[PDB]
């Protein structure tokens, strides 16, 4: 689930 941080999430 490191790909969540690669892909990002902001709004």
């Amino acid at each position, epitope marked *: *689930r*490191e790909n*969540l*941080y*690669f*892909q*990002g*999430k*902001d*709004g």
Partner: antibody
Amino acid sequence: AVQLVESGGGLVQPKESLKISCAAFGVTFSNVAMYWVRQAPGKGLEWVARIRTKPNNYATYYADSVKGRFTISRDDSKSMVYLQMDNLKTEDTAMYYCTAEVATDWGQGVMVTVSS
Amino acid sequence: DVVLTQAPPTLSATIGQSVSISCRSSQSLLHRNGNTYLNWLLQRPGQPPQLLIYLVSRLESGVPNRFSGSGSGTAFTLKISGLEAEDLGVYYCVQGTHAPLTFGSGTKLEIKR
């Protein structure tokens, strides 16, 4: 392995200040909005402050109860998030947790107690 | 802010029984990117929250097979299939699809014995 580690916090008098921080390890947090979340003793979890990423101008937002007293900031070069808490009130007494908008990884929390 | 209505507030059951918790959202949690950022957290007394389930159904590393999450849109479910003694504590749903992060009010699980 992803990890968040909080520091700072302790006992403080009403109207005093405290700065707590959150160090991220193991993968960049640059692409995620970051949050401080708190839990008053025996209560549930609630967001306190929010900071956006560089593309969104690092915009900051606050729960109504802390607006104009708490300031959230991040230093992406150091993988650090901070909460400056000014004019502290007894009802700010809580465990404070740092987390990203994906809400998958959590620090151990720091206790902030506000009492005379 | 998105309201997560969590039910029931308490659960009690014997070892080996199944229990379910409901998390119902005021807004669809499907993000425009296609992911649904709804997770389930467990908090043991005097401990930080820890991740059980993320992105609706994905099991966190180290979490036993008996935990499962499901749902879509505005309605979600956590199920424990065969309670064990160590499963007690407070369960919360949390969403990060729509900023700010918001939380259900928590379900306290007790064991009947």
